[PDB]
Design a protein around this ligand. Structure first.
Ligand SMILES: [Zn+2]
Ligand SMILES: [Zn+2]
Lengths: 235, 235
């Protein structure tokens, strides 16, 4: 019973310190009006430390995790959707870039940011559109941080794609239902030396909307079933 | 020269009879006014034979094909974004679902449809999508038709989702650049006794764009590389 899917979903929710909320229901700090005054004001572009916070939906987290896990020891890659509410960036959704490989990365500086921006460009202005609030890739066993290419890529993002964030994730290990290894990062412009590194880490929190729940259930189901197919991890 | 990706993409386009265009031009019979006219009219359910036509963006096609091929012998499932132009259904884009592909299906009638409808409902309610014109899956080596769970699924889809199409793809015998094996299908209410099965095939055409050129190229590239990884057929 505690070995079943639901008790596992609950354990995993607990280890990750989630919240049950309304998308607001305290999630948003700011009311719609003052959300828009900030959106229009663009308090970043001036303060480089402006964004101190990142909040990720259970849904977007789970899909990312499953993506990173399915990809194995290959580094996988994807984008993320969401809204900026003040200094807090909110990721409502995530998904997988159709093109997996490191040649879009290692072979040139801007290659990855260009694929990213062209995909986005196409994925709005035509069907279903978006607002893309960042990108994510996996560091399967070397942990969560930014490589030189992560950093150059994220800098191009924070020039052209702003607001944008880079999410790194390391699916390996972590028990069965247990703390995700994740990080969310922003770069600094080419000059910046706020001298008390070219990037910094936001503070990540997890939450789940009330309409996430059935999807969350099917998804977590598949995820847990595939957990059971490789095991002696849960002993 | 012709053993490179560029000329192979040429051969593929030619072999699929892709016609070039830009956006609103020459793919559409109509402009938004009338499209909205009949869009309110709901000519379908008048005529069960209403839509005779399906046109697929080359990006949707290549993406579905890459997904289908990567899937191997697993039956793969994804969604399609498009719009109704007259009796023509137009597919702008596709993308992968987190496929169970089986247990999302065989263990109950409405489960597949339920999952897709929850995915779509989710995406839409954040303001995204609105564009889903249908769904696609693959029959890897058994060819293009509807299996009767496909038929139940799609009958539901047409009840609730209604302007929805069911696409089936068979990702075999690539022969480098070749004709895709694909079909597009609509079902009948089963409150029907057709003029003379429980479904019918549309007439599929493929089409290309201007701005897509880089994106396609990118996709095509990966695709080509993947075929170079196993070839006794490139002799
Ligand atoms: Zn990295
Ligand atoms: Zn089928």
């Amino acid at each position: 019973a505690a070995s079943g899917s639901g008790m596992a979903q609950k354990t995993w929710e607990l280890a990750n310190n989630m919240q049950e909320a309304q998308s607001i229901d305290e999630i948003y700090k700011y009311d719609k009006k003052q959300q828009q005054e900030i959106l229009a004001a663009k308090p970043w572009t001036k303060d480089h430390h402006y964004f101190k916070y990142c909040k990720i939906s259970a849904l977007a987290l789970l899909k990312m995790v499953m993506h990173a896990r399915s990809g194995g020891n290959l580094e996988v890659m994807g984008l993320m959707l969401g809204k900026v509410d003040g200094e807090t960036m909110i990721i409502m959704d995530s998904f997988a870039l159709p093109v997996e490989g490191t040649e879009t990365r290692v072979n040139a500086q801007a290659a990855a940011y260009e694929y990213m921006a062209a995909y986005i460009e196409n994925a709005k202005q035509v069907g279903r559109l978006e607002n893309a609030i960042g990108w994510y890739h996996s560091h399967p066993g070397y942990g969560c941080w930014l490589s030189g290419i992560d950093v150059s890529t994220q800098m191009l993002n924070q020039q052209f794609q702003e607001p944008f964030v880079a999410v790194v994730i390391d699916p390996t290990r972590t028990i069965s239902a247990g703390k995700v290894n994740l990080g969310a990062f922003r770069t600094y412009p080419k000059g910046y030396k706020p001298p008390d590194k070219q990037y910094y880490a936001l503070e990540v929190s997890y939450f789940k909307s009330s309409l996430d729940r059935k999807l969350l259930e099917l998804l977590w189901n598949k995820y847990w079933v595939n957990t059971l197919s490789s095991s002696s991890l849960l002993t």
